[PDB]
Amino acid sequence: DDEEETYRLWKIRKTIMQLCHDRGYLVTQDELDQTLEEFKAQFGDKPSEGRPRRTDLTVLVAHNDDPTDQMFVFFPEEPKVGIKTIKVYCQRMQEENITRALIVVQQGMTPSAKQSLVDMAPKYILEQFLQQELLINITEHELVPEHVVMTKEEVTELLARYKLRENQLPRIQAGDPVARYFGIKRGQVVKIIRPSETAGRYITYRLVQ
Amino acid sequence: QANQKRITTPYMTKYERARVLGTRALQIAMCAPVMVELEGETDPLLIAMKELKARKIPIIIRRYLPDGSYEDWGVDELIISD
Amino acid sequence: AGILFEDIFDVKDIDPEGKKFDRVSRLHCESESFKMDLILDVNIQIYPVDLGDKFRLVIASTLYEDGTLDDGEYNPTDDRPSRADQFEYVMYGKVYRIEGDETSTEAATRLSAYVSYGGLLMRLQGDANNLHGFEVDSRVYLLMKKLA
Amino acid sequence: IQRRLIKSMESVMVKYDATVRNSINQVVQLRYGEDGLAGESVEFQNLATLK
Amino acid sequence: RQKLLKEQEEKRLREKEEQKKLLEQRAQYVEKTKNILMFT
Amino acid sequence: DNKKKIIITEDGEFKALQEWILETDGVSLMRVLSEKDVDPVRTTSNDIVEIFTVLGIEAVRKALERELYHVISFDGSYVNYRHLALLCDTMTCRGHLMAIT
Amino acid sequence: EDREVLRVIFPTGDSKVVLPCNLLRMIWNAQKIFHINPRLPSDLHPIKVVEGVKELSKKLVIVNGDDPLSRQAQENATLLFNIHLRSTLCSRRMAEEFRLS
């Protein structure tokens, strides 16, 4: 009832740190591989009563390339997150001058809250995650190959080399589990490197949609 | 497209060989001049294969690329395998 | 001369594994002058061989008594003096393997020449001194005669 | 099932830039079979340094 | 053995870079804790 | 050995560890993966739709290749891999599971 | 390095692969065409084996282009074959196993 709760919180935090590291955010090795006992020491082992509260689990990382390009990770307390909570988080992001966030909900998120997450995109790119899908890092699965977000220079080089348009590459949905893991939007290309039994290695490129 | 740099294979494909031989055989059958010498051959297909082996078929293969451009290869410029 | 090997063998066993083919029999023999083991496939239908028999085996590179190469082609209308006249059973085959007890650093003390006479297989194994005439993918003759 | 498969893949072809593409010119494989080799010439072999 | 010593001291340099990165993450975490404090 | 745990010993040899594995009659890959003492790396499913929903388009590409290979080879047959790869790329090149229908 | 690449490509120890050229059969063909004597020392320099295999690997082109993207795609297209080639046409195997001239 409680030991499993802190176990889930630690696992979610571990997946979030791996996710931020894969997105290119500055994550120390110490928190990247944090043992469960270390998590209990740093946050507690009684989340039910309030040690740790999910508001204490909030993460704030900075991109390696730009220290000003930071990102939040919020852990709302309510299972079904409402529009008011989204407004509160957006208000906090405005105060701290942060433009990216992840919201790790427990049960879900209301339709109004999702519509709010969709409409104000050009201002704040804040994403929605279920705690159920952060208990595992899907990129470690054997079926999932190596995904790599290409830069606009790399995409231009690719289209110039193979002499093709973006609509001629294979596609990946914007709502794909791995696309959501890497936080990639439409127009971006992801390079997938997978092993091939006929060639050894194979690189394919999927455009986000 | 820069003819100095043609990206397609330097080999004649099996389909290129098939169509070039058929085309040249029809041309021979329609009284086109033969580019090679002839001992007693009267079948246009045999004459066309002899011309291909001799690399003396006056045809250019225009290979289209997916982007829309094309590359022109002389039948003598390609590597005939079969 | 054109003789790669010559010795007298004594049939010590016939078909240890059982009769595999009706008209063909495998002889496991050992000589006395060189201490060489022999596995030989023989057409026992035309040249029957009994246990305990004793025969002279001569692996040769040619049949002509004078040093003269063969063409590998069948010439029944050949009046030259052939050494097959002095033997009863003659086969013609090729060496397809030469094994040995060599190491990465030491040469072979014992060799094992394998010959195929159109599918009838022979293995002549023993000291490497007696098997210098054998080279793989080389045609040889059997030249085998029974003695009392 | 055979007809359905055929109608689904009928126009996929190896192009002269060696990419495999459908009628829309979309790229299905950057090289045929990930190795750009035809299936008639390949054959079974053993990797000697694997086991 | 001299090349062994060069590779060994190279490993020492790399572990020292590990330590300098660790203290760099400490130097940014001491900033991040005040933001985490005013968060909740 | 296809379901055993193939490791590489310290001496460099391939060794097949004989370990317990579970086969379920339904699928909740989403939940089963996130269970203590369950391998979240090798645990898979034969329901390609769930693989697409949980792991994504390249995961379902690979899994679909595996399942088609299992269907083809179960009777000892063999099909060149480029044909399976082309079929599986046709069903997954547009980011979603394109049924052959 | 090729060994480790194969070990991550084939996580199960299955060395059966489908590749273009049957290198062992070609080596056997060369042994019989030139009448190679397996018992005599060879006149093939192992440096000639290394250099020749490298030049051969350069001549086997699936993806054409000097740009780095074409270079990487070329590396990937012929990776498995080049591993098979380097492990088959190795200088040691060519010296004590095949003994070619």
From Swiss-Prot, chain E:
Compartments reported by the entry = Nucleus speckle
> What is the tissue localization of expression for this protein?
Widely expressed.
List all membrane-crossing ranges.
none
The record's function comment reads:
Component of the PAF1 complex (PAF1C) which has multiple functions during transcription by RNA polymerase II and is implicated in regulation of development and maintenance of embryonic stem cell pluripotency. PAF1C associates with RNA polymerase II through interaction with POLR2A CTD non-phosphorylated and 'Ser-2'- and 'Ser-5'-phosphorylated forms and is involved in transcriptional elongation, acting both independently and synergistically with TCEA1 and in cooperation with the DSIF complex and HTATSF1. PAF1C is required for transcription of Hox and Wnt target genes.
What does the annotation say about its assembly with partners? Component of the PAF1 complex, which consists of CDC73, PAF1, LEO1, CTR9, RTF1 and SKIC8. The PAF1 complex interacts with PHF5A. Interacts with KMT2A/MLL1. Interacts with STAT3. Interacts with SETD5. Interacts with ERCC6. (Microbial infection) The PAF1 complex interacts with Zika virus French Polynesia 10087PF/2013 non-structural protein 5/NS5. The interaction with viral NS5 proteins may reduce the antiviral immune response by inhibiting the recruitment of the PAF1 complex to interferon-stimulated genes, thus preventing their transcription.
Provide the protein name.
RNA polymerase-associated protein CTR9 homolog
Which organism does this record belong to?
Homo sapiens (Human)
**Taxonomic lineage from the root:** Eukaryota, Metazoa, Chordata, Craniata, Vertebrata
Q: Which residues of the full protein are shown?
A: 853 to 892 of 1173
From Swiss-Prot, chain G:
Localization (cell): Nucleus; Cytoplasm; Chromosome
Transmembrane portions of the chain: none
Share the record's PTM remark.
The tandem heptapeptide repeats in the C-terminal domain (CTD) can be highly phosphorylated. The phosphorylation activates Pol II. Phosphorylation occurs mainly at residues 'Ser-2' and 'Ser-5' of the heptapeptide repeat and is mediated, at least, by CDK7 and CDK9. POLR2A associated with DNA is specifically phosphorylated at 'Ser-5' of the CTD by CDK7, promoting transcription initiation by triggering dissociation from DNA. Phosphorylated at 'Ser-2', Ser-5' and 'Ser-7' of the CTD by CDK9 (P-TEFb complex), promoting transcription elongation.
Q: Which family does it belong to?
A: Belongs to the RNA polymerase beta' chain family.
Subunit composition? Answer: Component of the RNA polymerase II (Pol II) core complex consisting of 12 subunits: a ten-subunit catalytic core composed of POLR2A/RPB1, POLR2B/RPB2, POLR2C/RPB3, POLR2I/RPB9, POLR2J/RPB11, POLR2E/RPABC1, POLR2F/RPABC2, POLR2H/RPABC3, POLR2K/RPABC4 and POLR2L/RPABC5 and a mobile stalk composed of two subunits POLR2D/RPB4 and POLR2G/RPB7, protruding from the core and functioning primarily in transcription initiation. Part of Pol II(G) complex, in which Pol II core associates with an additional subunit POLR2M; unlike conventional Pol II, Pol II(G) functions as a transcriptional repressor.
Q: What does this protein do?
A: Catalytic core component of RNA polymerase II (Pol II), a DNA-dependent RNA polymerase which synthesizes mRNA precursors and many functional non-coding RNAs using the four ribonucleoside triphosphates as substrates. Pol II-mediated transcription cycle proceeds through transcription initiation, transcription elongation and transcription termination stages. RNA-dependent RNA polymerase that catalyzes the extension of a non-coding RNA (ncRNA) at the 3'-end using the four ribonucleoside triphosphates as substrates. An internal ncRNA sequence near the 3'-end serves as a template in a single-round Pol II-mediated RNA polymerization reaction. May decrease the stability of ncRNAs that repress Pol II-mediated gene transcription.
Share the domain note from the entry. The C-terminal domain (CTD) serves as a platform for assembly of factors that regulate transcription initiation, elongation, termination and mRNA processing. The trigger loop allows entry of NTPs into the active site, switching between an open and closed state with each NTP addition cycle.
By what name is this protein known?
A: DNA-directed RNA polymerase II subunit RPB1
Provide the species name.
Answer: Cricetulus griseus (Chinese hamster)
Q: Supply the source organism's classification.
A: Eukaryota, Metazoa, Chordata, Craniata, Vertebrata
- Gene from which this protein is expressed: POLR2A
According to the record, which residues of the full protein are present here? Answer: 961 to 1061 of 1970
